[PDB]
Symmetry: C3
Subunit: 252 residues, 3 copies
């Protein structure tokens, strides 16, 4: 039985970490499984969005310290912890139950959107063990929540309850306990209903603009805009809207 | 009757999009009218602040798709949608009633401050039509509200209610329905009461610092600081404060 | 009696501006005193965290305008207002009571974390006197709170009440009036309990990553990570955790 489970529902790829006895800690198998799933997402024209979740009601306790201690290839060159150093092109939603800690919070941060149960919690407690959250936690958390709160969490290693995380803008959708995945599917379906080229281009511009200067951002953006505006889907979108009916996207 | 109306009240320029039957959608006339108004604002020494609003109780439904479809010069080279690619030097407040959607939200984002009615709403639904919000929406929204919420709005095309937008920091002032312009005038008057050179320099530093490195930001800032500190208004400000009375600014 | 008081409590350096009759305004003596305290913090292996506070129930009214007017060396080359242009390496918490205005807000912004009394207030009213908040206020406030609110505060010179500042993410901890320092000590103790090399490295990555590109951030981060992961404290942290007891850090 695979330690990462994958199920396709229409155009949504549901990815489930399947090590509940190990609190879904990331070992070599999970790291590879996550990378393979992201490859599948981006490579399959029939997929639009992925959801990442942890089986059994707990998202991810972080990297498997035992697996790490004994030489498992957990942090993979070019990919990081599963995909922390190589986020997918298509949208990724993290559906969080229970604890998303350390590497677990870093997986969530590598996703684009977070749906979290009201009783879930985040955190990067690495400094408590004289270590540092090097899987993107320090690079992404201050960009997702207010800088000083990210600093506080990083220096103290305190847990961040989901409801506070929603107040701070880290969590998009608060769900009833046990229903985060269903809430995430609803979110995914809203995104898969939109133009696939436009959705991917939109994510691309938001992510890449972080590295653009104010003086160049519009010209850099234009290069991404043109293939969308001349696509078949751009025509179909205009036709469908004018005819008040659902657009039939082709991703071309 | 002009499709963009302009009224000067003391040192405040009130700019009103005047196409209520077209939901104040931006066509060629409105685009040019907005650009002319911003030129007027920045060029007139007797003006300190502008307010942009949509006549009739709805801010702006976005770009006029019909005007666009039939070849109106709506997105002007060097300026964008009115002024989206050329924001004014002096402060601009958007006073939002009803819907500010797509290009309408992009106009608001190109302003510095937003006053919005409690029953108003924002959004960038471009992906629903297989298009992308290329008028600065994707470049500015993630800088105004938490990154993940900006991502969510961009990928889903969902409306953002004004009250939520205030929670997220996009909206400065929530106003009673129908009173956004009056609230905006109150805000504008607070700013026009302050030193005009200092106000413009302050905006300049906040906007331009986005493109400065940590190692250079103070030296870059200094170049903007010096002309302010040696201005006539700097002297007048100190004198007025010491004498507990209103400063008589000259903008020199 | 020194105009800046310094007390060591275990590994915490408590720094108190001691000019209550002058609302703890920063003159030459206070500027130098603050710089010396930060040097002490960073230079002493027995110190982990500092707390900055204003004696008597008011944080800092800003730069001493009288001292400034008559030629005191208040803004020191290479350091700024005390330390605004040279923030410490180790974590700094500002414990705010009463008013932190102008230069006072800039001192707080140069700290990493802010604990503020529920009845305290911030602000950068420089534009009211035809001046500009050049001590880092304009460079840091838009990075700590939502951009548009930072713009609003900078252009209006309005006070920012502590409770609103907490909503916006500027204030980490809201304290009962008169108890901000005790709340700050609790926060400091949480941080001093964590691995000193890991804490300093964590702060370093969060602060320096502001000037890194997305394409280089992980490689830049790695250089800071390696000395932490190979430290004696990394070993001790792992041992202590496995033995369910407190780690005895050495800062090596």
């Amino acid at each position: 039985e695979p330690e990462v489970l994958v199920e396709q529902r229409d155009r949504i790829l549901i990815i489930t970490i399947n090590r509940p006895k190990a609190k879904n800690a990331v070992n070599a198998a999970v790291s590879r499984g996550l990378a393979d799933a992201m490859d599948q997402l981006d490579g399959d024209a029939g997929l639009s969005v992925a959801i990442l979740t942890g089986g059994g009601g707990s998202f991810c306790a972080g990297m498997d310290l035992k697996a790490f201690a004994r030489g498992e290839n957990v942090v993979v060159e070019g990919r990081g912890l599963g995909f922390t150093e190589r986020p997918p092109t298509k949208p990724l939603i993290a559906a969080v139950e229970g604890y998303a800690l350390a590497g677990g919070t870093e997986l969530a941060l590598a996703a684009d959107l977070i749906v979290a149960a009201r009783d879930s919690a985040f955190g990067i407690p690495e400094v408590k063990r004289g270590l540092v959250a090097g899987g993107g936690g320090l690079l992404r958390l201050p960009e997702r929540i207010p800088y000083a709160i990210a600093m506080e969490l990083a220096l103290t290693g305190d847990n961040l309850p989901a409801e506070r995380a929603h107040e701070l803008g880290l969590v998009n959708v608060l769900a009833e306990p046990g229903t985060a995945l269903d809430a995430a599917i609803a979110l995914a379906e809203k995104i898969t209903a939109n133009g696939p080229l436009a959705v991917v281009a939109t994510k691309r511009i938001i992510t890449e603009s972080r590295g653009w200067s104010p003086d160049t951002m519009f010209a850099e953006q234009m290069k991404i805009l043109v293939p969308v505006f001349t696509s078949n889907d751009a025509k179909e979108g205009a036709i469908a809207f004018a005819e008040r009916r659902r657009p039939r996207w082709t991703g071309t």
